Every structure is written in structure tokens, then in C-alpha cells.
Automatic annotation (TrEMBL), chains A, B:
Coiled coil: none annotated. The keyword Plastid does not apply. InterPro entries: Glutathione-S-Trfase_C-like, Glutathione-S-Trfase_C_sf, Glutathione_S-Trfase, Glutathione_S-Trfase_N, GST_C, Thioredoxin-like_sf. This is Glutathione S transferase D10, isoform A. It comes from Drosophila melanogaster (Fruit fly). The gene is GstD10. Glutathione binds at S9, Q39, H51, I53, S66, R67. Homodimer. It comes from the Eukaryota. One of its GO terms (molecular function) is glutathione transferase activity. Transmembrane segments: none annotated.
Length: 209, 209
């Protein structure tokens, strides 16, 4: 299978960490140059009409949305179901956390930082407060818990590592969210794709230079 | 099980349509008065610390995020898997569509209309264009297709009916998206919860009065 991605991209990095966790290798990894509008070519649009990254192309099956890709890889190529268990309630909790990551936590990242790093606008304090709101919720989810979506390390932890590491490299102070700080340092140790993720975070950091 | 909801709410309506499709009845349906901050009570926060609607409470299991609830109901209470099939690739496509609904299509709704109906600001033309972008993608997804996520009616169709019916009641002209218009009228006919959904849309319409 081929992965169309950018190493700096948090959703891309979540997919890469998932593949590493599963012992899955991509037959091909294609870096999309979005400055050159490579996502807008007829060939790319044929695979992904929404022209987003990451895009997975697996024996003729095209898939996008990082969190859909993550679940797909576990369900198809996973030697076991630990990251996304068969149990309906356990999957449901992971799914809720994945939606939270997309719609609340990473949303708070893009809404605060993108206008700065891409649009060159000053920091918006109300958008900063929305990050704090999001971290407060994550902190509450982690109250009394080692992992973010149940008693075992799961896809939720990988998605959150991709997002939180982006906050980390951006210089956001999340130390004060005590449960988040605890969870983060421990989860890093349990993530075989961590080094690759942090290296990719450095590509993203270039936007802040 | 108990559902905490508001009839006007699109994510709530997606859950209600799913339950009807499955022949599932809620043992209790509790309308949350958000003007009275009922979602902020210790009792509500105990079930859902994020204080959102819809929230499902099923024999001690609390779940939120409408699309997580939808999948949960199919997987747990579904007599068959038709709406969310066992097949990994079919589930993956539905999942991508569900993320699109949350992050792109319904996002375009809230970003355009919420500042108007709740914050009393004038319509923002750039936000209007983002709706058109979203409908264009949905229109492309439906090119040559009867349903929105594969050859059979699925959870993707229910999520999109909840969202698109909200656009409909809001007065957005989507007729020009020919595939969307076709899909919508046909999908309504195949949705046993449709009448309840459209009635709930009238509660939402009150915000436009």
C-alpha cells in the first residue's frame, strides 16, 4: 500500500505511529507538495476527490481521514485487536475520543495557530482560551486513568500523541494539566513510532521559524 | 437506556433516526435545557464531563459524540450489520464519510449560521463559500452513486440526512447540487425516522424566526 502524506502533519503522524505499532510497513510513502498543488492533479483527485492528506491507497481501495485510516489498519492488518478491541463498548469509547481529538482538541490547535503561522495574524486570546478548554477536558478524561480510552493503550492514545506533540513543538505549556503531563510522558515510552513522530514534529516546527 | 438530547439538534436527530432504523426504543428520552445550563449540573457532568448533547446512558455506560453513538447502537443492538457492515473496507468508507460530516459538512453549517442565529452577526460570505465547497465534495461523492457510502444505505446516509435537512430547513439552496438533490429525496423515502427528523427540524427553525 501507498501512503500520501507530509511528515510534519499531525494526522499523517497519527497514521505513521499506528503502522509502526502494528508492524505494518507501507510499500510506498509519497510526500505531497501542497505548495505545488500536487493534491489537485487529476491523478490525486482520482484517488481522493477531497484532496486531503493523509491518503491511503491499498490495492485499489482509497481511504482518507486519518482516524478512519487508523481504524482500518488495526482491523485489517492487526495481529490482534488490542489497539481497537472487538468489544463494542471499548470501541465506542475510543471512537468518542477520536471525534474529540478531531473536533475539539486538534481543532483548537488549528484555530489558534494556523492564522498565525500561515495567515500571519496576531494571536487571538479567545482562541487561546479554547485550547485551555480542550486541555481541561482531556485532563478530566485522564483523571484516575493511565490511558485516554480505557484500561489499555489504544488508538486514542496514538491520536492524542500526534495532537499533543504538535502543541508541544508549538511551545504550548500543558505541564499545568497534571494528568495530561503524566499520560504524555508515559505514553511516549509505549509508542514504538514516537521517535519518527517527534522528528516529523520538527518539520512542522519550521512554520514557526 | 436513556438519551439526553434536544429535538432540534442535528447530531441528536442522527441518533434518533438510527434508533428508529434499528427498531430500538429508548427507555427514557430527556430533553436538556441548555438555556438553564442543565448540562452543567454535577449529575450531568458525572455522566458526560464534556457536557454535550446527545449523551447516551446505557446500563451504566455513558457515551457521547453522535457518530460514536450511531455506530454503538448498530454494533450492539442491530439485528443485522447492514447500516455498518462487518466488512473492513465498507466500514472504513462509512467512517471517512462520518468524519466528513462532522469536520466539513456540518462544520460549514455551524460556522455560517451560528454567528447569525445565536450571535446576531451579519452573514459572512466567505463562510457561505465554505458551505458550497462542502456541498461540492458531497456532490462528487454521490456522482454515479445511489447512496453516500457504498452500494447500500448506511449510517453515512443517516448522518448526512440529519445535516442536509438542517441546511434545508435553514433555507440553503442545495438543488443545484444535482447528485445531492437526487440522493436526498430518495434517502428520505428509505428512512423510517424521517418524519420525526423533519418535525425536529422545525424546533431548530425557531432560531430563524
Amino acid at each position: 500500500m501507498d501512503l500520501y502524506y507530509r511528515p510534519g502533519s499531525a494526522p499523517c503522524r497519527s497514521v505513521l505511529m499506528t503502522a509502526k505499532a502494528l508492524g505494518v510497513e507501507f510499500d510506498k510513502k509519497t510526500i505531497i507538495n501542497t505548495r505545488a498543488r500536487e493534491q489537485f492533479t487529476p491523478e490525486y483527485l482520482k484517488i481522493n476527490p477531497q484532496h486531503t492528506i493523509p491518503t491511503l491507497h491499498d490495492h485499489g481501495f482509497a481511504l482518507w481521514e486519518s482516524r478512519a485510516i487508523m481504524v482500518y489498519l488495526v482491523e485489517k492488518y492487526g495481529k490482534d485487536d488490542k489497539l481497537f478491541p472487538k468489544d463494542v463498548q471499548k470501541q465506542a469509547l475510543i471512537n468518542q475520543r477520536l471525534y474529540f481529538d478531531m473536533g475539539t482538541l486538534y481543532k483548537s490547535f488549528s484555530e489558534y495557530y494556523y492564522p498565525q503561522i500561515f495567515l500571519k495574524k496576531p494571536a487571538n486570546e479567545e482562541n487561546y482560551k479554547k485550547i485551555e478548554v480542550a486541555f481541561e477536558f482531556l485532563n478530566t478524561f485522564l483523571e484516575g486513568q493511565t490511558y485516554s480510552a480505557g484500561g489499555d493503550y489504544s488508538l486514542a492514545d496514538i491520536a492524542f500523541l500526534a495532537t499533543v506533540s504538535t502543541f508541544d513543538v508549538a511551545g504550548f505549556d500543558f505541564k499545568r494539566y497534571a494528568n495530561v503531563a503524566r499520560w504524555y510522558e508515559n505514553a511516549k515510552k509505549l509508542t514504538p513510532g514516537w521517535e519518527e513522530n517527534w522528528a516529523g514534529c520538527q518539520e512542522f516546527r519550521k512554520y514557526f521559524d
